[PDB]
Amino acid sequence: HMILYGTNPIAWSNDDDRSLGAHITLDQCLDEAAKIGFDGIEKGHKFPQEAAALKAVLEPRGLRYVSGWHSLNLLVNSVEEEKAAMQPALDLLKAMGSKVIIVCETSNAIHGDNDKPLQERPVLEDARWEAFGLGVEALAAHAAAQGITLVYHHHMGTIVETEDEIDRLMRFTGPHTRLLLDTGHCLFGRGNPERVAQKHIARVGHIHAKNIRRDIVQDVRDQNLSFLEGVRRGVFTVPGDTEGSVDFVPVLKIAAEHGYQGWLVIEAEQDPDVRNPFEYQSLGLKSLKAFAREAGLDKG
Ligand SMILES: [Mn+2]
Known part of the structure; x- marks a missing residue:
């Protein structure tokens, strides 16, 4: 299909804080993702990282390997260092048939630091934006030469x-x-996903349908909480949840009008004990497919 629907395993077992959902085995996560009806799933920390082993757990379940998160350190390492650092991820993605590599500069990131309030996030100095962007584009060209879109x-x-x-x-x-385009992280960061899509839809190669609970976001700011504290409180949830604040249909309508093709991935990290992953991910998939239909993105 032109539109594929994936999920991310952090709804079951968190990556930034591996104690969240540590009791949930990989087999449980993959079985539940498959039976919910997702076309694929993104990399998580409990996934095998060799092609043969990864196929052995995904192919029997009918799950495609969507993509994998890859950390960047362009602010501290040379471009050639980062090309070598990302090559193993590209080799795995090519062997799994993926078409996309998810990247993010994390050398100075604080979302994985439980003691640092989010307001103390790093801000890149204006004089360093040109060089950093040149490095990101260089990695994008390297990946593109190998058939992978960064x-x-x-x-x-x-x-x-x-x-x-x-x-x-x-x-x-x-x-x-x-x-x-991650709708949840966009709204959390005080932005509008619909406006971002209107500007950059032509450059958008991957979409994360992530919802946010506004009241929890307000708590994070008012009480000066860390990112992981917000996650544990329920700052993120799924499309179709009445407690969410993201309006998904306008975003998907912009995608439809410009002929977006690729993945819609439900990524909603939550405390799995409180927010059952099977329940919320099922609601997300049903609701996201409905929203894609209502926006004209999915014709079938
Ligand atoms: Mn995301």
């Missing part, structure tokens, strides 16, 4: 969090660099 994941607690910083990254990159 999509940059704007993220709370990193140097690319606000709407203005998303525009800046797009301005200082291209043509190969693409944007991973």
